Symmetry: C2
Amino acid sequence: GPGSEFMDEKTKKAEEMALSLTRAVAGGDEQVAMKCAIWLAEQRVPLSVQLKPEVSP
Amino acid sequence: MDEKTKKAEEMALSLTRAVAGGDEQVAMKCAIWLAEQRVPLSVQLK
């Protein structure tokens, strides 16, 4: 049911993939960015993608 | 707001909707454009 170990495993994996997408995009790694986006879309993750804010001092 | 930033914002929104809707080809197309432009992104699960 809700709050399962499996759901936490899959959420952890989806968060990893979102971080991998962010890094790949930032570094211009087009092949990895596409594979990360494919994976996220296959899983229909409720993802929010925004432009990173300028936060420097 | 330059034309490249406008497109980046469009691609981020399109990627968001594509992932939620399971649209793999659109997700691919948005991600490769963002990556080529090296757009700094903030990505998080809702």
